[PDB]
């Protein structure tokens, strides 16, 4: 199992992402 | 242009789809060979600047995909070829994952803009590369083809691989490996393929992909509305409307699904 981050309504952040603004 | 479906939005819900679909498309790009240990090929620091001291005649590192520059001087490309060659890599998890997808039957196709050729490695069958790979060789002008085995003791000695048929007093009778150089054009194999195949996946899976380039990056628009598109990338693609956005690491990605796949998939973790 991993951890990750729920972004309402389709959007999953796990380890190593990249999203900046 | 495709409308996101409303009605397929969770990680449940690309799991349920990986349980349920049998024809999958999976476009991969660079993201599922980045743990393989393979040093790039496209810049500096790369590749390029070990061949710079050996061969000062490359102006940059394109120009080993250049068919004219290759007539003149094929052997910084071999010696690239050497470093890449199949068999000096593991496949990552992702190969993995669509290799078994592919014994289990439940792959229709696997399109790939990579030239790693880890996907015959993987054992994944159903592939199309669309930048061609080192799957095969094929002389200049004869247009011979052998295997990848057949030219791996020459590329391994830094000797040209020569073709058998030709004359051996013929200067370009060289085994090219089927690489698509610049300008050359995407082989007969994958217009057919996209062709009927977008009217028969029933699940589209990015892993991987910026999908800035052609005719990958085209692939997404040309399948019908319907059908759910997930995107396993590191960044969101702005300029296309996932139905599911998992944003990470593509193997820890990869290796997350297959724990909740269970059965053959869970054993590959
Ligand atoms: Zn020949």
Redesign the interface.
């Known amino acids: 199992?991993?951890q990750?981050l729920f972004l309402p309504?389709?959007?999953?952040?796990?380890?190593?992402?990249?999203?900046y603004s | 242009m495709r409308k996101?479906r409303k009605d397929?939005?969770?990680?449940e819900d690309a799991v349920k789809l990986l349980q349920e679909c049998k024809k999958i498309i999976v476009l991969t790009g660079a993201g599922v060979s980045v743990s393989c240990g393979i040093p790039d090929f496209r810049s500096r620091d790369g590749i390029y600047a070990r061949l710079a001291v050996d061969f000062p005649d490359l102006p940059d590192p394109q120009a080993m995909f250049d068919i004219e520059y290759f007539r003149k001087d094929p052997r910084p490309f071999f010696k690239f070829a050497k470093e890449i060659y199949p068999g000096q890599f593991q496949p990552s998890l992702c190969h993995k994952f669509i290799a078994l997808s592919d014994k289990e039957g439940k792959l229709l196709r696997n399109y790939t803009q990579n030239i790693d050729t880890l996907e015959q490695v993987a054992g994944i069958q159903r592939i199309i590369q669309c930048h061609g790979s080192f799957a095969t060789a094929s002389c200049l002008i004869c247009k011979y083809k052998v295997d990848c085995e057949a030219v791996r003791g020459d590329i391994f000695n830094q000797v040209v691989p020569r073709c058998p048929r030709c004359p051996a007093d013929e200067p370009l009778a060289i085994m090219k490996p089927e690489i698509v150089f610049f300008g050359e054009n995407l082989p007969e194999q994958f217009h057919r393929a996209m062709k009927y195949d977008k009217d028969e996946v029933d699940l589209l899976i990015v892993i991987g992909s910026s999908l800035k380039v052609r005719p990958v990056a085209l692939i997404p628009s040309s399948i019908p509305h319907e059908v759910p598109q997930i995107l396993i990338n590191?960044?969101?693609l702005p300029h296309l409307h996932?139905?599911?956005?998992?944003?990470?690491?593509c193997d820890?990605?990869i290796?997350?699904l297959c724990?909740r796949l269970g059965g053959e998939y869970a054993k590959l973790c």
Request: charged share 25%.
């Open positions: 199992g991993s990750y309504p389709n959007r999953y952040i796990f380890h190593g992402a990249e999203v | 996101k397929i939005n969770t990680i590191r960044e969101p996932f139905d599911v956005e998992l944003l990470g690491d820890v990605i290796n997350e724990h």
